[PDB]
Structures are given as C-alpha cells and as structure tokens.
Paper text:
Cytidine monophosphate (CMP) kinase is a member of the nucleoside monophosphate (NMP) kinase family, and plays a crucial role in biosynthesis of nucleoside precursors. In bacteria, CMP kinase catalyses the transfer of a phosphoryl group from ATP to CMP or dCMP. We have elucidated the crystal structure of CMP kinase from Y. pseudotuberculosis and validated the function of the enzyme as a kinase. Yersinia CMP kinase adopts the same overall fold as related CMP kinases and is composed of nine α-helices and seven β-strands connected by loops.
There is one CMP kinase molecule in the crystallographic asymmetric unit, and the solvent content is 48 per cent. Clear density is observed from Met1 through Ala225 with the exception of a 12-residue gap from Glu180 to Ala191. The central portion of the molecule is composed of a central β-sheet, made up from β1, β2, β5, β6 and β7, and α1 and α9. The NMP-binding domain is composed of anti-parallel β-strands (β3 and β4) and helices (α2, α3, α4 and α5). Yersinia CMP kinase can be described as a member of the class of long-NMP kinases owing to the insert found in the NMP-binding domain, which is not present in short variants: in this structure, the insert comprises the anti-parallel β-strands, a loop region that connects β4 to β4, and α5. The lid domain is composed of helices α7 and α8. The ligand-binding site is formed by a pocket on the NMP-binding domain. One sulphate ion is bound at this site. The sulphate ion occupies the same position as that of previously published bacterial CMP kinase structures that have been crystallized in the absence of ATP.
Author numbering: 1 to 179, 192 to 225
The structure:
Amino acid sequence: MTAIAPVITVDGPSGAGKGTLCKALAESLNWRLLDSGAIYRVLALAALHHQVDISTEEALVPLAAHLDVRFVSQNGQLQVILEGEDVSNEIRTETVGNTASQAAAFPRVREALLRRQRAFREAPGLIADGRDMGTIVFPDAPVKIFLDASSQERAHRRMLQLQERGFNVNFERLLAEIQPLVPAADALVLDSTSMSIEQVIEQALAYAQRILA
C-alpha cells in the first residue's frame, strides 16, 4: 500500500545517473535503498565465499531467497553489506560480475532474487534502483521514474569509471561498444543528457512529494 511503505522506482540504462539519483533521493527522504545491479553481484559473492556449485541452481535458490544483504548510503557513497561484512569493493571485480551473469541465467534464481528484492519494501519507504523495477518488481509503485541518457553520455560516464579502476579506455571504442528495458506507462521520463544531476533530483523529489503527500 502507498502509505505504510511507499516505493519510488527508478529505471533506466547504466550510466545515466540512476545510482546517483537513487542515493540522493534515499538520503533526502531518509528511506531504504535497493540497488538491483548490486544484488546480483552480492549473490555471486555469497556464492564464491561459501564456494557452492554454480550449475544445477539447487543451492543458489535458497541463497538468493534469504540473501543477507543491505544497502546503506551516507554522504553520496554506496555501502554494501553482506552477512555483516562491508563488501562494497569486492562486488565490483570482474570475476564477481561474471559469476553474477552465471547465476542470473537460471529462472528459479531470478524468481528467488525477485522475491528477495520485493522484501526490501519496508517503512518508511523504499528507493528501488533497477531496470524493470516499475514494470515487474513493483508494478503498483506510487512513483515511477525512467532516467535515460544518450550513448555518448553513458559512454563518458563508463570511461571515467573504467579509468578510476585503472584501465585506459578509448572513448570511441567504448561509445561504439555501448552503441528488456522500457519505461513503465506511468513513468516520469527524465533525460540527464543536457540536464544537471541536481535538476534531475529536484524534479524527482518534487514529483514524488506531490503524489505521496
């Protein structure tokens, strides 16, 4: 239900400012935060730690279903906590994200993770950051937002990320490399291409706090 535990979903491609919009909404409203991309990686990090069979789906399903994960965000930085440990950096490595795509291939694991993500919906409220948040995870959410951006913009954001991790990147290689996913019919559509991220946040906040209150 809308009051009890409202959900604001934020859907879009990677590299559009979704992460940043969500951390900011979550700290402006003091709400819980679900980061969908990260949850698949935490599951795969949980799978590597407890070193379990990444075929057969039999062991990943209950892991997923009760995954001990929470997302805390203070002062703009995402803190990811698995079974107590801060695993923020651990879930960013390439091996982790390749085992996440391996788990993500079994439907029953996807359905398990879907139920785990719904269970994030609590008081006072949830900011849900993903791809299908407003269309599949929380189709009845009071506030849905779709945050798009051009391939160049997204390429640019990715370049800086890759460079921050240490790789040297070619912008034109990346752009071309980058060059389902749909707004929900009741999504507020924003484009961070020629808009500052502060403008996006302020429009998002104002939009949410006009529906919810």
